[PDB]
């Protein structure tokens, strides 16, 4: 559905210095970080 | 001499050898429990962190 307006959410994102063209509305899969010290 | 007529002997009947039933790791239950990840170079690793 919509909950708070998606257009309004994207506008609020834009006005507060974030130039996010598309705010994700769904499943997001990021990459786990593996840090090695040699 | 009847001693010229001798036939006592014994023979081998054959033998069988045991083969080892091999285990392929990914085909046991524990396979999905573990994520096995290739990285041969680890001797030069001091301390890794996630």
Curated annotation (Swiss-Prot), chain B:
It is found in: Virion; Host nucleus. Homomultimer. Makes the hexons and eleven out of twelve pentons. Interacts with triplex proteins 1/TRX1 and 2/TRX2; adjacent capsomers are linked together in groups of three by triplexes, heterotrimeric complexes composed of one molecule of TRX1 and two molecules of TRX2. Interacts with scaffold protein; this interaction allows efficient MCP transport to the host nucleus. Interacts with capsid vertex component 2/CVC2. Interacts with the small capsomere-interacting protein/SCP. Belongs to the herpesviridae major capsid protein family. Self-assembles to form an icosahedral capsid with a T=16 symmetry, about 200 nm in diameter, and consisting of 150 hexons and 12 pentons (total of 162 capsomers). Hexons form the edges and faces of the capsid and are each composed of six MCP molecules. In contrast, one penton is found at each of the 12 vertices. Eleven of the pentons are MCP pentamers, while the last vertex is occupied by the portal complex. This is Major capsid protein. The lineage of its organism: Viruses, Duplodnaviria, Heunggongvirae, Peploviricota, Herviviricetes. The gene is MCP.
């Amino acid at each position: 559905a919509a909950a708070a307006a998606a257009t309004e959410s994207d506008r609020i994102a834009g006005i507060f210095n974030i130039p996010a063209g598309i705010i994700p509305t769904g499943n997001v899969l990021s990459t786990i970080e593996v840090c090695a010290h040699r | 001499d009847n001693s010229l007529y001798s036939a006592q002997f014994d023979i081998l009947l054959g033998t069988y050898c045991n083969t080892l039933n091999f285990v392929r790791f990914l085909e046991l239950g524990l396979s999905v429990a573990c994520i096995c990840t290739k990285f041969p170079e680890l001797a030069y690793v001091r301390d890794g962190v996630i």
